[PDB]
A paper describes a structure:
Despite the extensive mutations, all these Omicron subvariants still utilize ACE2 as the host receptor.
To further analyze the RBD-PD interface in detail, we also determined the structures of monomeric RBDs (BA.2.75, BF.7, and XBB.1) bound to the ACE2-SIT1 complex. Despite the presence of these numerous mutations in the subvariants, our structural analysis reveals a strikingly convergent binding pattern between the RBDs and ACE2. Of particular note is the single difference among BA.2.75, BF.7, and XBB.1: the substitution of Phe486 in BA.2.75 with Val in BF.7 and Ser in XBB. Overall, these mutations remodel the interaction network into a highly convergent mode, despite the presence of diverse mutations within the different subvariants. The monomeric human ACE2-PD exhibited binding to the RBDs of BA.2, BA.5, BA.2.75, BF.7, and XBB.1 with binding affinity (KD) of 4.80 ± 0.01, 3.2 ± 0.03, 1.2 ± 0.01, 4.1 ± 0.02, and 16.2 ± 0.03 nM, respectively. However, despite these mutations, we have identified a convergent binding pattern between RBD and ACE2 in the BA.2.75, BF.7, and XBB.1 subvariants, suggesting ACE2 mimic monoclonal antibodies might have the most broad-spectrum neutralizing potency.
Author numbering:
A (entry chain E): 338 to 359, 364 to 383, 392 to 516
B (entry chain A): 19 to 615
Write the structure that this text describes.
Amino acid sequence: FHEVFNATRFASVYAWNRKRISDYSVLYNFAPFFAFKCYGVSFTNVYADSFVIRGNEVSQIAPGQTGNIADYNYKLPDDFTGCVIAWNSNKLDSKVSGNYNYLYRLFRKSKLKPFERDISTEIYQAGNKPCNGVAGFNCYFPLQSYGFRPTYGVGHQPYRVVVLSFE
Amino acid sequence: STIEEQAKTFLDKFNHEAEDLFYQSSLASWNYNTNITEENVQNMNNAGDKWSAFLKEQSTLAQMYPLQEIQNLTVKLQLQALQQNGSSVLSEDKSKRLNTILNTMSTIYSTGKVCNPDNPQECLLLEPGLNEIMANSLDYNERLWAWESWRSEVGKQLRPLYEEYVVLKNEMARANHYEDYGDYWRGDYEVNGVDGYDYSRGQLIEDVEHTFEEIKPLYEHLHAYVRAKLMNAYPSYISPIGCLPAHLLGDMWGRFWTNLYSLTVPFGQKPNIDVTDAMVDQAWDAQRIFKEAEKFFVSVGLPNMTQGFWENSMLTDPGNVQKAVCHPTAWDLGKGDFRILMCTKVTMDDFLTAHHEMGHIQYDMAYAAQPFLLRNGANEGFHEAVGEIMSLSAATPKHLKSIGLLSPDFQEDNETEINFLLKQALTIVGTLPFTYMLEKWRWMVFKGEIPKDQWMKKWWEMKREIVGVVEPVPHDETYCDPASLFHVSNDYSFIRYYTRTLYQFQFQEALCQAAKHEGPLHKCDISNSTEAGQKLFNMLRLGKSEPWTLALENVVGAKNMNVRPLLNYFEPLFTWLKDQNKNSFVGWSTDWSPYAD
Ligand SMILES: *[C@@H]1O[C@H](CO)[C@@H](O[C@@H]2O[C@H](CO)[C@@H](O)[C@H](O)[C@H]2NC(C)=O)[C@H](O)[C@H]1NC(C)=O
Ligand SMILES: *[C@@H]1O[C@H](CO)[C@@H](O[C@@H]2O[C@H](CO)[C@@H](O)[C@H](O)[C@H]2NC(C)=O)[C@H](O)[C@H]1NC(C)=O
Ligand SMILES: *[C@@H]1O[C@H](CO)[C@@H](O[C@@H]2O[C@H](CO)[C@@H](O)[C@H](O)[C@H]2NC(C)=O)[C@H](O)[C@H]1NC(C)=O
Ligand SMILES: *[C@@H]1O[C@H](CO)[C@@H](O[C@@H]2O[C@H](CO)[C@@H](O)[C@H](O)[C@H]2NC(C)=O)[C@H](O)[C@H]1NC(C)=O
Ligand SMILES: *[C@@H]1O[C@H](CO)[C@@H](O[C@@H]2O[C@H](CO)[C@@H](O)[C@H](O)[C@H]2NC(C)=O)[C@H](O)[C@H]1NC(C)=O
Ligand SMILES: *[C@@H]1O[C@H](CO)[C@@H](O[C@@H]2O[C@H](CO)[C@@H](O)[C@H](O)[C@H]2NC(C)=O)[C@H](O)[C@H]1NC(C)=O
Ligand SMILES: *[C@@H]1O[C@H](CO)[C@@H](O)[C@H](O)[C@H]1NC(C)=O
């Protein structure tokens, strides 16, 4: 666990890593863990999904939620049986002059079904005339960036999130 | 797909990009203001120019969505706030000329100076030295010299510039379907398409002229009292049935009568409440003040401070070399970054400015969830009114005696409350006729009802019959007396200062009814009551997403501004004045002039 919890670089929201490996009292012994909730329980395989999102969006990593994260980026099934933890990382993932290395998708033609990933980056068409792979009027680039900075109020600061799914 | 989905999809991207760019520009401007360096000026100007360029690009991009087929009111509000052209409908020639004359008027007002008749090498500016003479002097001849010279030396340079500023602004407004510039200015209070809360642009004039005819009975008694008190400091210069000379009113234009309090104090042997020694003997520093302000604000049910407010703010004057602009303001940088910039002393007026600025900060914190374009007060007069009611409620003896700055017994008498109410009326009531008259003159000048050969004539007749103030020297059509004021030569609207004074007392009288107050209104304190906090937060959290006629109703219960709460506030002073003017002549005559003999 000390490799998916200590990774020096985490993945963006729209392309989130999913680590599968073959001691729970160690994670329970660490930093304050701003959010820590597991709904179904207090296994054949374990899954560890990890990413970096904003503060006020940590409320969307939960079964039965809506928004721009639980719709287009990461959707959890309503029959969830894992446990989601999230902690602040303002002193690591935030830089003066912006940390534009973390992106997320805010335009998509359909919502995501649970545990699906989508990394394609074609131009989103909002109107009725074809776009032909070039931005402009009613054609948009679907991936935008967090402008993370240290002088941000909580809820607008970077939060590292790890979901541990159990079968 | 219809037209509305495309509008929402455009507004999402705009919201995100504009939020980021605005945060960058605001942080640059804060870094310049808190630490003055000439490289910070360039670091700020770069971000400012790039933000303005992004804004103009997105504005010319948002024109391709017709406003007559958007059916949502939020989307329509945002698109209509973004689609407006403002300037740039003029040619490059005319826009260049307009910017040139605006800059010229600004620098003429900023760097104009007058000097003595007996020593021409002693020239004084307006800011350090003219409004010091006009504020501290009791010499009739010195005040007359300053008043006349400021208008005859700077006021005569601004007339030929104003005469074409009027025309340029008028065609700029006509190019945007507004019929004049005054209508463009009144277009802030307009509400459309709500079917019950509407408000026209021509109804503001009627509602402003209707509320002023109820304030006249109090302003007339205040005028008579002030005149009968000035007849003892300037004998043989004031007539007991006439107007007041324009240079004896406390400042350069007569906008505030607050500097006449030393001459017209009711009972000079009862000192006003002033908790300054009790703070310095208890060693209150520049941060205990803000702790007390935050405690007062959380007492009524409002949230705490942001925990980033304490490290990033500037609550004390900076050190030896970090020269900064010391002007108490509240900054709303964005992304949850609220700050306060003021170089506080240990006084009683900084103790009130703290509450004012923290009320501003609480308002900014309330509507932080609205879209980027709907983050402002319901109109121009809501923000300062919300900031002012806190400073009103934080200066009552019931509050200071509970904080600990006054003795635990401190029996208060009625003479002290008369002193307090007169000091308040000299700055609250003494500025409503002036504001109303100035804005009426500007409206009529822009409309075309006053030909350019009758500006000074109409100005002084309106000053005589409305304000009750007479000029000490005849002024022909080569002067420009209004343009010698800051807001006129800098292109600012002046009606916000009128509606704010009414919204303030409406809010106060609506919140003192929820806190279960029983005595007079000028003694009310809303602290320790959560009903007032809830009633106010129900309005603070809306921003511009609702018409102002609905936000106003959420608190008060009416739809338009009323003037009865102000008279209910000043009733004891009104009774006392009515009893003091049994022998004087309440009113003035519009024929007496100081030079008429
Ligand atoms: C995460 O990694 C850091 C460093 O990569 C760990 O910090 C170490 O903590 C031990 C325990 O005292 C020290 O002996 C080491 O010197 C620390 N490392 C460094 C580089 O100073 C931290 O313990 C790790 N946390 C988890 C949960 O694995
Ligand atoms: C106020 O501004 C000045 C000028 O920008 C700053 O002075 C320099 O700041 C840079 C940025 O950290 C330093 O690398 C230099 O060593 C500073 N030089 C001098 C002579 O001061 C100054 O630091 C700013 N004030 C604060 C508190 O940061
Ligand atoms: C278009 O109008 C509708 C209602 O007229 C708005 O719907 C509201 O949306 C917010 C946030 O999604 C909800 O909290 C409200 O409950 C919705 N209203 C109702 C009555 O359910 C919608 O937001 C408007 N469009 C935009 C872009 O704001
Ligand atoms: C803003 O100014 C422009 C020109 O400066 C006005 O003209 C319209 O601009 C749009 C956007 O390019 C064109 O699609 C129209 O064909 C132009 N002519 C019209 C509408 O007659 C525009 O009307 C102005 N908008 C407002 C709200 O005043
Ligand atoms: C608001 O209410 C609180 C609590 O009722 C007041 O605080 C108490 O005031 C009494 C009387 O002055 C003291 O004996 C207590 O010691 C105080 N307790 C605390 C925790 O301060 C407070 O004075 C009230 N404030 C106002 C402005 O009425
Ligand atoms: C302040 O209150 C005192 C006490 O009520 C007032 O003194 C009385 O005033 C009335 C009015 O003329 C007299 O009839 C009484 O004889 C006065 N009392 C005494 C004991 O002589 C005083 O007038 C009030 N002052 C103001 C400005 O309202
Ligand atoms: C506000 O902060 C103080 C400490 O500064 C704390 O005692 C109080 O409980 C807080 N109130 C709220 C509503 O968070």
